[PDB]
Design a protein around this ligand. Structure first.
Ligand SMILES: CCCCCCCO[C@H]1O[C@H](CO)[C@@H](O)C[C@@H]1O
Length: 158
C-alpha cells in the first residue's frame, strides 16, 4: 500500500508525510462553502490485492491558520459527514486494487460571522490530514500524513 498526490509526490510502503498544495475558490461569502476536495489530489493503491485487503481511515483532521481562525468545518469521508477539526477516527474504506483510487476526503468550510477580508493566506498551512492504513493480513498499521497548503488567498466579502 502506497499513495501519491496529483503532481506525483509520493508516500511509499510504511507511510510518512507529504505536502499537498491546493487551489481554492478566491471568494467565499458568509453562508457559502469553501470546498477542499482532496479526492482529486490524493490517490492510493493496494500492492498485493491477490492476498491482502487494505483498510483506510481518516484517523484525524486538524485545522490551521486562516481555516482554524475564520471557518466552521465539516469533513466528508466516503459519503458521510463529520466535524472538522475531527473528534473521532472514521470507519474504514477498502482498497483491493493496484489501480490508483482516490482517497475520498473533502473539507466543507463556511466562514464564521467574524470573518471578513483575506480569510486564508496564499502559502499557509490550512490542514493536516492523517490517513491510517491497516490490513487483514498482519499487524501493519501506518500513518500517511498529508500537510495541506493554500495555493492562493481566499477573500470573505464584507
Ligand atoms: C510473500 C508475501 C509478500 C508480502 C508482501 C507485503 C506487502 O506489504 C505492503 O503492501 C500491503 C498490501 O498493499 C499492505 O497491506 C502493507 C504494505 O504496504
Amino acid at each position: 500500500f502506497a499513495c501519491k498526490t496529483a503532481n506525483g509526490t509520493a508516500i511509499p510502503i510504511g507511510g510518512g508525510s507529504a505536502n499537498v498544495y491546493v487551489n481554492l475558490a478566491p471568494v467565499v461569502n458568509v453562508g457559502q462553502n469553501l470546498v477542499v476536495d482532496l479526492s482529486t489530489q490524493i490517490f492510493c493503491h493496494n500492492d498485493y490485492p491477490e492476498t491482502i485487503t487494505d483498510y483506510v481511515t481518516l484517523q484525524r483532521g486538524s485545522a490551521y491558520g486562516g481555516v482554524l481562525s475564520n471557518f466552521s468545518g465539516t469533513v466528508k469521508y466516503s459519503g458521510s459527514s463529520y466535524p472538522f477539526p475531527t473528534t473521532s477516527e472514521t470507519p474504514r474504506v477498502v482498497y483491493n486494487s493496484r489501480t490508483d483510487k482516490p482517497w475520498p476526503v473533502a473539507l466543507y468550510l463556511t466562514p464564521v460571522s467574524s470573518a471578513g477580508g483575506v480569510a486564508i493566506k496564499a502559502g499557509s498551512l490550512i490542514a493536516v490530514l492523517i490517513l491510517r492504513q491497516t490490513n487483514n493480513y498482519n499487524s501493519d498499521d501506518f500513518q500517511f500524513v498529508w500537510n495541506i497548503y493554500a495555493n492562493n488567498d481566499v477573500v470573505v466579502p464584507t
